[PDB]
Amino acid sequence: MTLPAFKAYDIRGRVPDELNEDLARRIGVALAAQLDQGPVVLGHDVRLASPALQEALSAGLRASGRDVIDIGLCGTEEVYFQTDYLKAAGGVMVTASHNPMDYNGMKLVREQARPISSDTGLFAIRDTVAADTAAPGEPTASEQSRTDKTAYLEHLLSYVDRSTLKPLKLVVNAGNGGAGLIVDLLAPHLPFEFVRVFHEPDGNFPNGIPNPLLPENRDATAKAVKDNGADFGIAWDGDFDRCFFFDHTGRFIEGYYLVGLLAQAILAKQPGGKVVHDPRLTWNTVEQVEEAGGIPVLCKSGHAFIKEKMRSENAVYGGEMSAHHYFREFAYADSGMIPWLLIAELVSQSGRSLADLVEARMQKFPCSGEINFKVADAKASVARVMEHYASLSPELDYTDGISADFGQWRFNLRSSNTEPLLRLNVETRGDAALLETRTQEISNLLRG
């Protein structure tokens, strides 16, 4: 038995049996022993238990001599940004994404907001916490409240030339998470008219836990766009490190296509740079990056792998189709805010709608959408897929599960690192029929 809340990438579990104030305090103590010198930034999301868990983390950190910088209710990217900006030793964001109401969690970073993951400190914290029967000591360091968002907001706005922006009408859907607070702080500096949907932070989640991928939640943004004639819409998850785009027809744009589009937007500002992308869906990104004079860099999926590869490559931008977009000067971190500012600037400057910006790309590299499978035997199921296709001799790559490139179509098939699932992505060279027949064929094999 090990504490189940400790996952590969972060901590998450049901309160109070898998995560509670006692464990939170012990995590703070253990984190203090894992970090280089300096204070620790703490922030939390809108969930009802988040402040108390953060307080417990603070008590454990301060009992271990760490000054705490409490940045308050915020998004995950604000913990990243402030940890790096203030040159802190590390940071913790108290958040659970789209987990049930009785769940919470923590995302931990060290210096420069470098992720702490299972094999880079998180399981060391787990093992310390698991064995810690010490009496809780008393605080020896202090907590300061630092809710000034000025440097954060200036950083976000530095990505666009405000004088080129047009008064676009934008639907924004925080899903009752925290994104609306940042939208409202940016709004005085922008010419846009916002149509605010599910805007107020509310950890009771009266309109559902924030997950723009669920069709009922997707449709709320789509309807607001259509009914208001908005140029485009943006929705976020609760901690707003993920962003989801809807064109002026209400159509949700698959996150794959935002990677190539945002890469081109960044490459116009930082020419010739490297762009990091995941292996799930690739061909459109590679082509668009190259077309814009950048250099694409294939990387395993998962935010910590993306960030590490961006650092080693001095990459200007990285993007995953799972709705995460990473920016070198933003501490190599992901932001749910930078992407829509860039897209709004692109629409403003080009005179093209978001739909037009992506339409030809979606026709040229149609994709299945990510299809998930919980099967009895994942390894045997993957083996059945590969055995079926062996006679076509695809080019195989093992960066992240199995990528198989057949020429006019390819797939990526991999185990998720956040759920016990297999994830399938298929794309083709402009061939919707081949896309469907191969996707259904693989699905049948996986379910066999």
Kindly state the smallest distance separating residue 14's Cβ from Ca ion, in Å.
18
- Beta-ladder partners of 428: 409
**Between 283 and 340, whose beta carbon lies closer to Ca ion?**
340
Q: Is 27 left (phi over 0), alpha (psi -120 to 50) or beta?
A: alpha
In angstroms, what CA-CA distances link 51 with 8, 106, 108, 140, 141?
24, 12, 16, 21, 19
DSSP at 6? B
The interface partner of residue 9, options being ligand M6P, Ca ion, none and the CB cut-off 5 to 8 Å by kind, is ligand M6P
The 3-state DSSP composition of the chain as helix, strand, coil percent (nearest 5) reads: 40, 20, 40
- Nearest residue to ligand M6P by CB is 416
Residue 126's nearest CA partner among 199, 228, 23 is 23
Please state whether beta strands 317-320 and 324-327 pair in parallel, antiparallel, or not at all (unpaired).
antiparallel
Q: Is 112 left (phi over 0), alpha (psi -120 to 50) or beta?
A: left
Kindly state the smallest distance separating residue 397's Cβ from ligand M6P, in Å.
17
12 binds ligand M6P (CB under 6 A): no
The interface partner of residue 239, options being ligand M6P, Ca ion, none and the CB cut-off 5 to 8 Å by kind, is Ca ion
Q: Which of 78, 241, 308, 320 binds Ca ion (CB under 5 A)?
A: 241
70 binds Ca ion (CB under 5 A): no
**Between 312 and 418, whose beta carbon lies closer to ligand M6P?**
418
**Between 395 and 419, whose beta carbon lies closer to ligand M6P?**
419
The interface partner of residue 221, options being ligand M6P, Ca ion, none and the CB cut-off 5 to 8 Å by kind, is none
Footprint of ligand M6P on 396-425 (CB under 6 A): 416-419, 423
Kindly state the smallest distance separating residue 334's Cβ from ligand M6P, in Å.
8
Q: Which of 237, 334, 345, 427 binds Ca ion (CB under 5 A)?
A: 237
Which is catalytic among the residues 58, 64, 97, 368? 97
Kindly state the smallest distance separating residue 276's Cβ from ligand M6P, in Å.
12
Kindly state the smallest distance separating residue 256's Cβ from ligand M6P, in Å.
12
**Between 192 and 326, whose beta carbon lies closer to ligand M6P?**
326
Helix residue ranges per DSSP H, 278-377: 283-291, 303-313, 338-350, 354-364
Contact region for Ca ion (CB under 5 A) — 93-101, 200-208, 300-308, 322-330?
Answer: 93-101
Footprint of ligand M6P on 360-399 (CB under 6 A): none
Footprint of ligand M6P on 249-308 (CB under 6 A): 301-303
Residue 93's nearest CA partner among 124, 57, 62 is 57
Contact region for Ca ion (CB under 5 A) — 90-98, 109-117, 169-177, 261-269?
Answer: 90-98
Kindly state the smallest distance separating residue 414's Cβ from ligand M6P, in Å.
7
Angle at 149 between CA 348 and CA 207, to 5 degrees: 70
78 binds Ca ion (CB under 5 A): no
Please state whether beta strands 103-109 and 143-145 pair in parallel, antiparallel, or not at all (unpaired).
unpaired
**Between 203 and 255, whose beta carbon lies closer to ligand M6P?**
255
How far apart (Å, rounded) are the C-alpha atoms in residues 320 and 306? 9
The interface partner of residue 320, options being ligand M6P, Ca ion, none and the CB cut-off 5 to 8 Å by kind, is ligand M6P
The interface partner of residue 237, options being Ca ion, ligand M6P, none and the CB cut-off 5 to 8 Å by kind, is Ca ion
Would residue 97 show up in a list of annotated catalytic residues for this protein?
yes
Q: Following CA atoms 388, 390, 395, 399 in sequence, which dihedral angle do they give, to the nearest 10 degrees?
A: 60
Can you tell me whether residue 446 is helix, strand or coil? helix
How far apart (Å, rounded) are the C-alpha atoms in residues 61 and 142? 10
CB 62 within 8 A of CB 139: yes
324 binds ligand M6P (CB under 6 A): yes
The interface partner of residue 118, options being Ca ion, ligand M6P, none and the CB cut-off 5 to 8 Å by kind, is none
**Between 105 and 250, whose beta carbon lies closer to Ca ion?**
105
Say which amino acid occupies 21: E
How far apart (Å, rounded) are the C-alpha atoms in residues 148 and 81? 12
Kindly state the smallest distance separating residue 373's Cβ from ligand M6P, in Å.
12
**What is the arrangement of strands in the sheet containing 143-145, beginning at the earlier edge strand?**
11-14, 103-109, 90-94, 40-44, 68-73, 143-145
- Give φ, ψ of 228 to 5 degrees: -110, 5
322 binds ligand M6P (CB under 6 A): yes
Kindly state the smallest distance separating residue 319's Cβ from ligand M6P, in Å.
10
In angstroms, what CA-CA distances link 113 with 82, 139, 205, 277?
8, 24, 29, 20
Does an H or E element contain 244, and which? strand 243-246
Contact region for Ca ion (CB under 5 A) — 11-19, 160-168, 218-226, 234-242?
Answer: 234-242
Instruction: Summarize as ranges the residues that interact with Ca ion (CB under 5 A).
Output: 97, 237, 239, 241-242
Instruction: Give the active site residues.
Output: 97
Instruction: Summarize as ranges the residues that interact with ligand M6P (CB under 6 A).
Output: 9, 301-303, 320, 322, 324, 416-419, 423
